[model samples]
Target: NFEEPADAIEYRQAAFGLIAYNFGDMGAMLKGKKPFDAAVFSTRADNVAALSKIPHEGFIAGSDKGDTEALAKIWQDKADFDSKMTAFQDNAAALAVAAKSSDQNNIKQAFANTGKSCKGCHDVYKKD
Candidate 1:
């Protein structure tokens, strides 16, 4: 069973909370349920991409447990964990690049890819 420091978990979850917050707002505009505002989408997408680094910092060894949805197996495989993190970082970087552009379609595709990365990791590591 994975266990960890309370403060570590606390800070990490908070970062994730912010990530979801930004992604939710960004997704709203992209989905057509809301009007697409270039300024807002650019800003929110940038925010999510930049803040992407926060969760990795939060995932420090001692932050593995607590109220986190991450599975215990994550702590058991250092190589897999590192690879997953690299994948997330890469996707986030790609999103950042796409967000800097004026193309809506490009941004949408990049954003979707980033979301896919999140789902992929969650599938392997996080619980419901």
Candidate 2:
């Protein structure tokens, strides 16, 4: 609904900030840097799942040129970017499903997969 590119940039960055905040805690648990609590992990999983779907709407036609790690290639090759974004959404949902289980192994595998999807898109479309 925003007509300004900067507004869209800010909106997407906010969504990504929330996603990273939630995902970081889960990653800490995975790495043994934090004690694994099933309830806390599940809560973070839900947060990430919900937040994962929020950012793409902000990637409007001209929003790529603002204060963002997003590359101009995102607009140039939007189909590829969209596909990567879809992969991330799929992986995040899968992680949420694994989180519902009490099994640490299941959660870890899904977490790894989701992380890879994140990295895969970032590697392609985000600036270093």
Candidate 3:
């Protein structure tokens, strides 16, 4: 039962939070607190990849149903939205490679870049 608008928002937020937490974890791993593990890093990377698409999907789903919660402003600026999503996916893929290699420098770089991608999209597309 997809009954609540807040549910959509919560779902999106949870996914977004996963991306943030994983990126932070990557940072921690890079700092030598714990060893980098490809499996964990790859899982997080995949989460970022998946979460990056949720906003667009949620907006489109709401719009198609004539729901006002998502708003037309989002649909209007979809290209920018897509650009951010692309950046996240690209960064996530790079992070995955860094994870596989256990390259600390690359991991830090990828983590920072991926965070920028997250912020870029949130700045333009997200509303509270």
**How would you order the candidates by TM-score, starting with the best?**
2, 1, 3
Which tens-of-lDDT digit does each residue in 37-127 have in candidate 3? 7787767766666666554444444542332333455667778767777778888777666666656677778778877886676576655
lDDT, model 3, position 67: 25
lDDT of 1 by residue, 9-74 (tens): 776678778888888887888887789777777777778777877766556665555677767777
Cα lDDT listed for each candidate: 0.77, 0.91, 0.65
Q: What is the lDDT of residue 123 in candidate 3?
A: 70
Q: What is the lDDT of candidate 3?
A: 0.65
Comparison by TM-score, 2 against 3, better one = 2
Between candidates 2 and 3, the lDDT winner:
2
Clashing pairs in 1: none
Per-candidate alpha-carbon RMSD to the true structure: 3.2, 0.9, 4.3
User: How far is 86's C-alpha from truth in model 3 (Å)?
Assistant: 1.4
Question: Which pairs clash inside model 3?
Answer: none
Q: Write model 2 residue lDDT over 29-128, tens digit each, in one string.
A: 9899999988999999999999999999998887777577888899999999899889989899999999999888889999999999888988888998
